[PDB]
Design a protein around this ligand. Structure first.
Ligand SMILES: [Zn+2]
Ligand SMILES: [Zn+2]
Lengths: 76, 48, 112, 252, 24, 91
RNA sequence: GUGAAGCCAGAGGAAACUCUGGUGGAGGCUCGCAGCGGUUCUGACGUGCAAAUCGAUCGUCAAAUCUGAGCAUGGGGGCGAA
RNA sequence: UGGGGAAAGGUUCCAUGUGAACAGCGGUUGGACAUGGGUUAGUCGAUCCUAAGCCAUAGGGAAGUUCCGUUUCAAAGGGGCACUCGUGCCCCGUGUGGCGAAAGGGAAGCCGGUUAAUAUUCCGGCACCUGGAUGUGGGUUUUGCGCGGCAACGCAACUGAACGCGGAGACGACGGCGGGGGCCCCGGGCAGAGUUCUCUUUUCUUCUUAACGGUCUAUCACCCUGGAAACAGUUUGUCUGGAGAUAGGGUUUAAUGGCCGGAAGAGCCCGACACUUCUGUCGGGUCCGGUGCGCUCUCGACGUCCCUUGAAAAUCCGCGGGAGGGAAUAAUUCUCACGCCAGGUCGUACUCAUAACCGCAGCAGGUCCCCAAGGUGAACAGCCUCUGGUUGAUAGAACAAUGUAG
């Protein structure tokens, strides 16, 4: 796991041949939004504190790869 | 414990300016010998 | 206050079976096996530890980039730097004494 | 009877020498052209102590006259040498403490050490802590030199033998008493298996010639002849005289 | 660096050169 | 506050090994544990490491000396003889 | 538990040097658990738990202390603080 | 008398069933009898290197089975290139075998779940090391092989053959003192449980954060200005200073320290609904400080003792030197980031002992290590308790002599 500091280069990571998937996890208690992408070697994480800019980010990324929501209590 | 207490007090006095180095050094060797029983006895000797 | 056990077949305390205690997200006390501690390289002449070079086991030095393994000057490794200055001064003065010695001998004693 | 103790030591099974901690033997350089006609010099790197011996050793580094490398050596250290000292070896070397020069280029009355019995065997005589040999006189024809050995005997050696000026370091090691049984054990535990030692009178007749009896005694003369079979030489061998040494010793 | 590290690098350059020669 | 009348350093041996034998060892122990001034740097820090090795704690020089003393009377007398003999004869 | 060298402060003396209070932590020193050993009861058992064990009482315990695996010495031979 | 291992044993492990025999009484039970099942590795070991030591080769003895010999009176080796094609050239040369450690040296994996019986191996998630091939991004170059700081030195890269020098691997016992992790201890808060004739804002339990990375720091030491006697700094323990102290400002070795990812989506504690079963679903909570000659492990700076000074090799890196090679329209032998492929062989069940090893046996004997709670107390002394484990050693009735123990 490795931090991605800003928004600009995070979309650069997602536009790669080996970006298999991505997911979204939201923490209601702390008002925080996390964007995760799975590459061949690492799992880059981008942290956003605001919620308005999150909506724009979701649609800017390429439509090929899937996006999930990470529900509560994932089944075994 | 007693040696650390006496030595710590002397450093505080020198930095503030209550005593100078010539009196500080002489009191240091007096404390190494069994001269001062406790903290109260040392400050009383300084005033005199 | 739970007690722990080893996780490998070696049951003896032989300066290569080194362990430390960790607490796991499952709320249990386990044992984690660790390696030995690297030693800092020394100077060639005086014998003190060089500054600016890390201390690792001898095999790990093959995976690190060059600038992290040296210092940018003459005799970058293996010499402290105080010893390097002595070499520069000593080498210069010795050769100067050689020039005057040979001129004195060749001129003042072979004039005939 | 059985085989007595001093006969077993020749088989070399338990009574060998401990040699794990000894690094190298102490010798001079081989005789070469440079040291036969001129001189060379070397640096003293370390003064080290090796187990099982007094007389601390010294490590000296020389160059190579024919190849691009340097050779390290191991000498016996004379008293007064220090790390970083320059020492010289050869025929024309100066006469100072620590130098090595042939025994011919030496005035009478000087003390030297580690003298070669024959030129090229790299040191045989006078190499123990605080010992030396003295030159007495020369014979310029049929070159041979008279020397006096530490034991007092006199010898004649060829004039080309080598020696190192001075006295072997280590001083008066044998003055203070050992004072403890343990201290004796530590001294011998790094040399050989010869400690402790049992008196022959306390054994049984099958073990030693001194044997048993209803009282502890020898029973016969303790001076043994020079030519006797092995297993008989237990005592004072070929003794010329006996008893406390009162007067002066005529032999010299 | 050890010899095997140097042997690998020079073998790569030799292979690269032949491909250029084969092409031209 | 002297703690001893005559025993001195050899008080760790208690009442063993006999009175006479303790005196000889004290003569030799006192002189080997002391400190001597260095001949090169001048500081007062030279101590014995091995049976015949003495080294300075400041300038790191190492010198070979006697068993329990930096120098011995026999060795000192020889240097002067050698120096006097050499310089008159060849100069 | 005892408290050896080294060090600090004060007092006495013409001097040489001597007293008093602390600091420090040496020794094949000492009481004493586990380990190792085996003095007495000439105790128990003595076709026994056991072809050498059991109980109480004992010796030493930071050093000539205790111990695992690998290797060497073979019968008129080995090894032996005897 | 708990939880796991080395030597040794060899199916004793798990399930179902059972007449006789064995378990010095019984037996529906069993380590017995009968029938089936069970041990998954690039990361844990062997495999690699040498030590004490053993055995080939050159040679010498002995009628002979064989004894000695390990670098010795030996013509003893290994490195590169190109050819259609192996078969052709060119350098260096003092040296030139194997075996020998599951406790020595050593490249690399952590958490959660799962089976009647195995898992650091299986499943899910997140990582690492070696070897072999190759492409993009960035860097360097027309002054051909980088810039900055007075300095200690710094950064994402930033040519380097022969030969040579140096470091790491690499090492004793003991003593007090300081920093870090774990355990123990005290106070407050949210949940559940025990007690209640009376008292007790009471007593007890849960409140967790791995490998691997980013960023800010932490003894020693080192650098710059200046020039100290009315001598100064200073450790529990008197060492340091014109060979440059005090003071002011900087660089650097060392996280089991703080914060962020991994990571709450996990694990744990309560509550409310569902039902032959295949099956469950949904709510909340998962905090804040203090203390010490405390116990244990680890790191650092000092000190004492010696006629005692406390292993070797494989492997890995830096430097001196300057062979060869290379652009002006691209080339590149850039130790930087990302990307492609692969990792063979054998062991892995269970006991380690008042029943699984050795003593003729299910024998009061013997047999090497790791972890270590509360009270009293100087204390790993003795006595009582919590987690965990047993309730297994032929039984019933009576109380004369003589016995063993108290
Ligand atoms: Zn240096
Ligand atoms: Zn000095």
């Amino acid at each position: 796991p490795q931090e991605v500091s800003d928004i600009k280069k995070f979309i650069e990571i997602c536009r790669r041949k080996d970006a298999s998937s991505a997911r979204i996890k939201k923490n209601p208690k702390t008002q925080q939004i996390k964007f995760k992408v799975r590459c061949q070697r690492f799992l880059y994480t981008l942290v956003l504190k605001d919620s308005d800019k999150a909506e724009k980010l979701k649609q800017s990324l390429p439509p090929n790869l899937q996006i999930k929501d990470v529900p509560k209590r994932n089944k075994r | 414990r007693r040696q650390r207490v006496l030595r710590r007090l002397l450093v505080k006095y020198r930095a503030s300016g209550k005593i100078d180095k010539h009196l500080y050094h002489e009191l240091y060797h007096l404390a190494k010998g069994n001269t001062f029983k406790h903290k109260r006895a040392l400050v009383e000797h300084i005033h005199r | 206050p739970t007690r722990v056990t080893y996780r490998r077949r070696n049951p003896y305390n032989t300066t290569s079976n080194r362990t430390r205690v960790i607490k796991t997200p499952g709320g249990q006390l386990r044992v984690l096996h660790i390696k030995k501690r690297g030693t800092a390289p020394k100077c060639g002449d005086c014998g003190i530890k060089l500054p600016g070079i890390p201390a690792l086991r001898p095999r790990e030095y093959a995976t690190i980039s060059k600038p992290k393994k040296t210092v940018q000057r003459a005799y970058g490794g293996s010499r402290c730097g105080n010893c390097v200055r002595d070499r520069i001064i000593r080498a210069f003065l010795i050769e100067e004494q050689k020039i005057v010695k040979k001129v004195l001998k060749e001129q003042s004693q072979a004039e005939k | 009877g059985r085989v007595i103790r001093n006969q077993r030591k020749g088989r070399g099974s338990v009574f060998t020498a401990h040699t794990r901690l000894r690094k190298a033997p102490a010798k001079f350089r081989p005789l070469d052209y440079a040291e036969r006609h001129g001189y060379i010099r070397g640096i003293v790197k370390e003064i080290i102590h090796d187990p099982g011996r007094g007389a601390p050793l010294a490590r000296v580094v020389f160059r190579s006259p024919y190849k691009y490398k340097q050779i390290t050596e191991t000498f016996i250290a004379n008293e007064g040498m220090y790390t970083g000292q320059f020492i010289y070896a050869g025929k024309n070397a100066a006469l100072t403490v620590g130098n090595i020069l042939p025994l011919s280029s030496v005035p009478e009355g000087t003390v030297v050490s580690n003298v070669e019995e024959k030129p090229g065997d790299r040191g045989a005589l006078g190499r123990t802590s605080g010992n030396y040999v003295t030159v007495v006189g020369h014979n310029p024809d049929e070159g041979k030199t008279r020397i006096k050995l530490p034991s007092g005997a006199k010898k004649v050696v060829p004039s080309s033998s080598r020696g190192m000026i001075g006295i072997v370091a280590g001083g008066g090691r044998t003055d203070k008493p050992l004072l403890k049984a343990s201290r004796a054990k530590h001294k011998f535990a790094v040399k050989r298996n010869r400690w402790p030692k049992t008196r022959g009178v306390a054994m049984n007749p099958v073990d030693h010639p001194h044997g048993g009896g209803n009282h502890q005694h020898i029973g016969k003369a303790s001076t043994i002849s020079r030519y006797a079979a092995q297993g008989q030489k237990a005592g004072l061998i070929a003794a010329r005289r006996t008893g406390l040494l009162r007067g002066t010793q005529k032999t010299k | 660096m050890r010899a095997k590290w140097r042997k690998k690098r020079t073998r790569r350059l030799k292979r690269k050169r032949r491909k250029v020669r084969a092409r031209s | 506050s002297k703690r001893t009348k005559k025993v001195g350093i050899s008080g760790k041996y208690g009442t063993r090994y006999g009175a006479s034998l303790r005196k000889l060892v004290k003569k030799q122990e006192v002189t080997q544990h002391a400190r001597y001034t260095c001949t090169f740097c001048g500081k007062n820090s030279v101590r014995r490491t091995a049976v015949g090795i003495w080294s300075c704690k400041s300038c790191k020089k190492t010198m070979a000396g006697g068993a329990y003393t930096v120098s011995t009377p026999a060795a000192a007398a020889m240097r002067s003889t050698l120096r006097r003999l050499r310089e008159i004869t060849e100069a």
